[PDB]
Amino acid sequence: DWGYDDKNGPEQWSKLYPIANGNNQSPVDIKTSETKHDTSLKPISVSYNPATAKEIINVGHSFHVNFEDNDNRSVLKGGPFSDSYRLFQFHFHWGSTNEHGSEHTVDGVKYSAELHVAHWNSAKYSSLAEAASKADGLAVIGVLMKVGEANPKLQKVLDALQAIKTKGKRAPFTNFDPSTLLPSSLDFWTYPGSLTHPPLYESVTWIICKESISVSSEQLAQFRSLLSNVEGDNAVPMQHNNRPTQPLKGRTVRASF
Template identity: 25%
Template sequence: KIRFAFFFFFFFLFFYLFIAGPSFWGLINPQWNMCNKGRRQSPIDVVPDKLLFDPFLRPLHIDKHKVSGTLHNTGQSLVFRVDKDTKQHVNISGGPLAYKYQFEEIYIHYGTENTRGSEHYIQGYSFPGEIQIYGFNKELYHNMSEAQHKSQGIVGLSLMVQIGETPNPELRIITSTFNKVLFKGQQVITLE
């Protein structure tokens, strides 16, 4: 069993790195052609020394309304989706955004170890976790499905998670339900 698992691991690693990994996504599926050009590809490694400072960049604004929704284990990550009948929606605006985006989903990525779990990297460093916040352009589209494949349709924000001593009460609202979604397909309703 150990030899089989070892062989399978290296076969998967070889397959991912040299046949079907991120470098080949644009070749495997025509719908992913932007990946073949090295643009709009995920995961990414943010290298701070290569970033340009924009002195005119406005502060990013996220409304501070309480929302309820459902936390779902997809088997790859945990996804929080805002209830469709939410009374007050949370909007994301400012920064580099020319439009208002309505918050709809949070993807939570984490690993089996406390050192690696983020999907993206900063200067080659993987964080223990990553929270990705997604919203759709509410000025041009009616919902996520309509906006998904359109220009300026979706905005995504990534927050890298470090493990520390100081608790985060807002994050605790969602993380306190993690024990109810341990397995793929499980979901739990989270209240404001």
């Protein structure tokens, strides 16, 4: 239905999802001269159990790496949160060339891709489906990915893609701790926002890392070689899946640093 093509993409999502033009939409451009340092922000604490890794899925516009979320084996705490948030997925966004592909920008600078590590509030809610539409329901860590040296931490993820080439394919994806993908510094920006694609719920507290991680030109190429079609149809590579930045509408981006 929705996608990233000219007909079904970001500038058209508002026709079926009017919250696309809301006051808490993501991503945003982080202007560093407008951020406010908040003394009350605690360090980010991630503690993930590799045994929670479950499955990798070609979802047509992207691929998702899902985690078992029946208990608190894998949690995010700290930062702006009083509640524990339970890991459920990570995924990436990328663009059609190295020049763009991140969702968030910093001082107008576009990176080549972005990693999202997503969690839901298990202190207040009983399931992702309950949490996903609540203002305090989701927490996503975003990592900007700067084109440069090959990142060996991506190897297991990239090696898995050949088994999920076309839409709907899925495979087991086990024994992996995604905190290995995060940068050395967890210094961060935070702001209240949204899912960056439909259904665009304004339910996400964003944690954007100040430090980038690397990716090579060829690693990006592997993401863009995934196919959005189902097996047996004409091949339609997944060339891009990044939303443009959206107006802050008077929100404050807080800095931990």
